[PDB]
Design a protein around this ligand. Structure first.
Ligand SMILES: Nc1ncnc2c1ncn2[C@@H]1O[C@H](COP(=O)(O)OP(=O)(O)OP(=O)(O)O)[C@@H](O)[C@H]1O
Ligand SMILES: Nc1ncnc2c1ncn2[C@@H]1O[C@H](COP(=O)(O)OP(=O)(O)OP(=O)(O)O)[C@@H](O)[C@H]1O
Lengths: 242, 242
């Protein structure tokens, strides 16, 4: 007994996106509901798949706990089955932070990188979160001129990104999974601390089986590669969450 | 009695681009011919305007001489009227270096910047020079991972771009002209020195009259604003080259 889940869900979400609903708990905490909605191509492709929110909330809680254990400060407070998460309320910085270990996705489409090729070092990419503009890639000068964050913050965010990568890449490799790349969102809590927020799940990470390189993330849905839920379940399974 | 110009021109160009032809003089020097061809939208729009090569070579020679006088090392050796330039031969780094003082062009199209609005500081943008990929914008990590240049070179290139900007912006302001932005190319000479190469002309700079903000650069041609050659000539006039 700590939060009145059933009563909070009866309220109107402070915000409702394409995959999750944010409900208010109090002044500094929110209830995050992982829905069964799954999207691709920026909304262009959508469906509702049973067990998606359950698996993503489950995996995300585990990765956050792993990060916290390694000193990475996050918005995670606790997991409430099957698809809810209690988190510290933050003000999200409109920047998609992408870290890449293997060339894939837009990197290969936009530059002469061979898909599946190991990168010399983890590439960090900042994208402007703005639908009207198609989420264009940013460089440090532009983000600062746009007033999205200060130079020092942008660099701190990059360091957090690389630390997150270090923790996760190792964790998944031990579980026979290759962390191809991932995207995180950072936000400032009531005290102004920079916290990894949002989620960290197969919806936000590219994960390939180490042996076969079978796709285990949302790309399965984007490119209709097979049973996405069954693959998401393999991830949870590998992490020992089932 | 300089180089054997008339004889050099009879030779097949080492390279011919959309606006200039590169002829070999010797092992470490080249003759650069500014043609009258003018293009926009990546070759999609083209024309031949008498006097363009003459005006751009004339202006570029003057700007290079100004940069050299301020310590910026360039490939410029001497100007041969009406449209030729003797330059140190260099290996061009496939990166388009853009510096912006005022928001315009792609900056306003890709991000929520107000056109004509003064930027808080000179924004430096690196674009990958590659037709097959549409010259995508780069960030430091991508450029290095692609092997275009070392991190140290990239930062050295940025320092150069900003010094160039400092010199040119002041020069044009004294001549009643606002240097909105510009794009330069860097190359390595026989000794490995990083030199500002190619050209610096109304074809590569956005220049607006200080009082009226009338466009004086190639945008006049891109958007059919009027007599492009007459405007280019105004730039030459202001610089006292006519
Ligand atoms: N701790 C938090 N406090 C406040 N808002 C949060 C927190 N964590 C994540 N959010 C926001 O929850 C919203 C809904 O998630 P989703 O529904 O995942 O968003 P989108 O994916 O619809 O928006 P993004 O594409 O996330 O802007 C996102 O806009 C995200 O920034
Ligand atoms: N000092 C130099 N030595 C060797 N090559 C040079 C030198 N200066 C510029 N160049 C090259 O000469 C070409 C100029 O022709 P342009 O007609 O200017 O080419 P593009 O139109 O092919 O230019 P991009 O190639 O668009 O810069 C460019 O490809 C440029 O990189």
């Amino acid at each position: 007994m700590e939060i009145k889940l059933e009563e909070i869900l009866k309220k109107q979400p402070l915000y409702s996106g394409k995959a999750k609903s944010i409900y208010e708990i109090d002044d500094d905490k929110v209830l995050i509901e992982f829905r069964d909605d799954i999207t691709a191509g920026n909304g262009a492709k959508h469906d509702v798949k049973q067990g998606k929110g359950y698996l993503n909330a489950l995996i995300s809680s585990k990765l956050f706990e792993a990060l916290e254990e390694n000193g990475v400060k996050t918005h995670y407070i606790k997991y409430i089955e099957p698809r809810y998460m209690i988190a510290k309320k933050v003000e999200i910085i409109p920047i998609e932070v992408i870290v890449r270990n293997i060339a894939a996705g837009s990197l290969c489409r936009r530059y002469p990188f061979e898909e599946g090729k190991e990168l010399p070092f983890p590439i960090v990419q900042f994208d402007y979160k703005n639908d009207e503009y198609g989420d264009p890639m940013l460089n440090e000068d532009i983000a600062v001129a746009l007033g999205l964050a200060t130079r020092e913050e942008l660099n701190k965010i990059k360091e957090i990104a690389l630390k997150v990568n270090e923790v996760l890449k190792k964790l998944f490799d031990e579980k026979g999974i290759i962390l191809v790349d991932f995207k995180i969102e950072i936000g400032k809590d009531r005290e102004g601390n920079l916290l990894v927020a949002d989620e960290i799940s197969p919806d936000t990470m590219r994960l390939w089986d180490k042996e076969t390189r079978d796709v285990l993330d949302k790309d399965v849905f984007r490119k209709d590669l097979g049973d996405v839920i069954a693959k998401y379940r393999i991830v949870a399974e590998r992490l020992g969450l089932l």
